[PDB]
Amino acid sequence: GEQRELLIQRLRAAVHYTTGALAQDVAEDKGVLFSKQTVAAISEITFRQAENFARDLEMFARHAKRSTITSEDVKLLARRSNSLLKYITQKSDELASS
């Protein structure tokens, strides 16, 4: 149980590092400072959304009688935004070409 909580922390603070990075980049382009609390939030929010990308990806595969998540599963996930789906289908046509 404790080992889990430790995984939690390493992760949460991980998504925090990357969040803060992406966050700065947007900050430079747009020319505005993000409060620390701002990035904190964006971070937690990202973390939470993960739970639903997760449980929906689980669902999405196990519906194909499968335990292993494919590019197809991400695409299905991403179907609900035409812009978003267009873009991730692009990223997968780049990634598929190897």
């Binding site: 992406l22 964006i42 993960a50």
Partner: protein, 75 residues
Amino acid sequence: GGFRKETVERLLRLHFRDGRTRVNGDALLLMAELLKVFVREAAARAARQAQAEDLEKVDIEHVEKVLPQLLLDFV
């Protein structure tokens, strides 16, 4: 920059409701690009918001004001 493939993987695994559930590789890359987009989006909508309030500092209330719409447009 971006998200570490491994951390994505451990993040997805954390929330799975059945032990045996696992993720392929090119998936993990795409879940990475996807996460990046979600974050750059929250950041930019919040910044948009602040900037349109004639503010230099993007503050937490901006993340909240844009948050509900963000969750919608996205998944």
